[PDB]
Amino acid sequence: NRPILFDIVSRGSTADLDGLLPFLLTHKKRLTDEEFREPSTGKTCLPKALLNLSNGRNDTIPVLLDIAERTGNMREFINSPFRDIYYRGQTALHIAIERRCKHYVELLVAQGADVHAQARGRFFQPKDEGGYFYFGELPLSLAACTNQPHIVNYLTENPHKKADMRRQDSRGNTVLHALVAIADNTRENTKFVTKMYDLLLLKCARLFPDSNLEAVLNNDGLSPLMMAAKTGKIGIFQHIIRREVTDEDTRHLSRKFKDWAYGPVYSSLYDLSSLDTCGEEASVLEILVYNSKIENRHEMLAVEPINELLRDKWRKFGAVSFYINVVSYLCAMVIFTLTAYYQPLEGTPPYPYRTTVDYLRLAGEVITLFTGVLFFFTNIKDLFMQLLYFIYSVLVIVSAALYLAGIEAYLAVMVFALVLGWMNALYFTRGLKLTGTYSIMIQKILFKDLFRFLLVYLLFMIGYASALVSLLNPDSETFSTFLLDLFKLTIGMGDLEMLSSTKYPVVFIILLVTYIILTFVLLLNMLIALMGETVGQVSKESKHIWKLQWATTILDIERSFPVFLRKAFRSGEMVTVGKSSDGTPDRRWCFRVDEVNWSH
Amino acid sequence: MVIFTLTAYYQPLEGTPPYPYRTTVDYLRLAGEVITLFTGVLFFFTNIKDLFMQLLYFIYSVLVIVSAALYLAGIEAYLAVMVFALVLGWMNALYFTRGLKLTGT
Amino acid sequence: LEAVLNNDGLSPLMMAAKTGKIGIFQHIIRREVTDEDTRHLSRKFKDWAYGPVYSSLYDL
Ligand SMILES: CC(C)CCC[C@@H](C)[C@H]1CC[C@H]2[C@@H]3CC=C4C[C@@H](OC(=O)CCC(=O)O)CC[C@]4(C)[C@H]3CC[C@]12C
């Protein structure tokens, strides 16, 4: 009778249902029997009826509910979930809410519909995880994510059942987490996202004054603000960072207060407790600056307190430590250079020391080894809990070890270390503004475009030179010699005296001509062109890249210091902005900004 | 192309073309030669079918086949054109980066 | 009607593509007919919708 029932419900006709009650009573067959349910998914009668209706009025639902109550299977029938990978978990209430039918939502909850049921089927998953619509996996989160204020209002405060706002799905995300998860930078989306977020926050605070809704964290460990920063959602991040609440009852949770005004000058202090931390917990700034592949990484930093905080930190302690570090690094490299220079050529390593000058060389050596081990330890700690610096440190330590063992080879690698030691000194110009943007651009072009160009050139050059070598007739040694000669000719110095043994010299001349033409005219020119266009495309990006580089250097310096030193240098003044519900003072960290307005 | 490069490199300078084969190394060179000729004839057939029903590849194939023919006939000149083929063989390897996005533009 | 081909062997869609006419090519590639009598000749149908997600299958 399953096909007949499905046809009856799909049609929506009331008459066909007559007689089902006595039929079930006589045969004592429940509406959740395997035969009645569709084997493919598990869909029961109610979801099918709700799926296909007219102008929000199916007109069959009450009869189905009455029948199920007659049987006495409402508990297992009204909330019967779907099976299968695609739609697992989905219940009738999810459908009713998805179809924007308040009437049916009320009628469903009135009868005992499970309001906390989770719909974690593969249809409802994040876009990156092979899904279509992620909404928090809850009826309440669904209504909040589909921009339906009335549904959320009724659902939260209903006599029969209440879905508390502070509730977490399998992933741990709460309704605010989902509402940030579906946010997009479009104006239409943000306009309702912010409104619903604020409404829901105020309602939760009103109902429960003790707890805080944004305190909750998901399994990942983030909060709505940190997650919005991580997911690159400027629209809601900017509205949460400057949230101000005029209501006196709910002013405690506000984030931006007015401090004082004199004429056109207005001075307001922002709150940055969660925004900036000293190792107590993860900070928005660290996440936004250090994580990669962020949509609006550069735009997100242009917010009223963020930029001024970076500025104040830079003045307070950023500049001094940077100059100290660069000077010390240069001095250390000079000491290393002197040590390598004065390495005694005579004898074999290690060399005995029996004079004060020997002890001077030893002092330089120990300083260099200390620097190398320090860099190695810093990199290893970073890995456990700067690739070029890692190479420098590992090469230094290996050179010291081979010096201890006894072999000439160490000097080579030791010298190589010195090369790298200066090769990256340019990267310390990063902190400087005028030359730091140029250093960042040089590093960017060097790694991305120069890797491709070099890889393109290597095989071409080696194969073409091998072809020319094969052309000549009087053979690894011959190739080894000729390759040096050919590279020297590529430099523009030398002479092609080796062609005497070759037959058909004309074609060899032509081939060398074309080789030179390609190497100098086309290959070299394209490298020139690429730099010119990239800078033009990033002409505006220059300031963005510079600001990001400045931020990352400042944050690296801040991270390096231990916790208590950070406590000493922490920026912002403790300001008692009000008294909590119990009356005790807040005493919350804040940072002050003042502007000028001639229109207010 | 690597196989072709090795074949050209190990072409015996001594003697005159064709060179008799009486050793396993000779058969290694012969295997490389037949592979190169197969590649050339395949490219030639593809281009000829396109024409009946890639100009640089057409040049590569025609030069390879001509070099093989002149190797069979007996003349030193073939090596020249054979080498020239190898040049073109790599000269257009860059054009296979086309498919890649970053370097294809 | 679009089955007919000229001496060249093309159809209105192929000819619009060959002649570089975006305006009519885009309107012929997404042609949808609401009338039930003449829905067979339509080229873009709606498949299903869930909330803000809409899924339509084109004919190719
Ligand atoms: C254009 C870019 C992408 C390719 C990099 C060029 C190198 C692959 C070339 C440039 C100079 C060449 C070298 C010139 C001299 C020698 C020594 C030679 O061995 C000898 O010592 C005998 C000759 C001599 O002693 O001068 C072996 C090859 C090598 C390293 C040559 C091999 C290839 C080198 C490093």
Numbering used by the authors:
A (entry chain A): 150 to 534, 550 to 638, 662 to 787
B (entry chain C): 482 to 534, 550 to 601
C (entry chain C): 362 to 421
Question: What's the paper's own text on this?
Answer:
TRPV4 is a polymodal, calcium-permeable cation channel that has emerged as a potential therapeutic target in multiple conditions. TRPV4, expressed in the plasma membrane of a wide range of cell types, is a polymodal ion channel whose gating is controlled by multiple endogenous lipids, and exogenous stimuli including synthetic ligands, cell swelling, shear stress, moderate heat, and ultraviolet light. Human TRPV4 adopts a two-layered homotetrameric architecture where RhoA attaches to the bottom layer. RhoA appears to act as an auxiliary subunit, interacting with the ARD through three loops connecting AR2-AR3, AR3-AR4, AR4-AR5, and with the membrane bilayer through the prenylated C-terminal tail.
Three additional complex structures were determined in the presence of distinct ligands: the antagonist GSK2798745-bound TRPV4-RhoA complex in the closed state, the agonist GSK1016790A-bound TRPV4-RhoA in the open state, and the agonist 4α-phorbol 12,13-didecanoate-bound TRPV4-RhoA in the putative open state (ligands are abbreviated as GSK279, GSK101, and 4α–PDD, respectively). In our ligand-bound 3D cryo-EM reconstructions, we identified strong and unambiguous EM densities corresponding to GSK279 (antagonist), GSK101 (agonist), and 4α-PDD (agonist) located at a shared site within the cavity between the VSLD and the TRP domain (termed here the VSLD cavity). Although the EM density for the pore domain in the ligand-free state and the 4α-PDD-bound structures was resolved sub-optimally, the high-quality reconstructions for the GSK279-bound closed state and the GSK101-bound open state enabled us to unambiguously model the register and assign the gate residues.
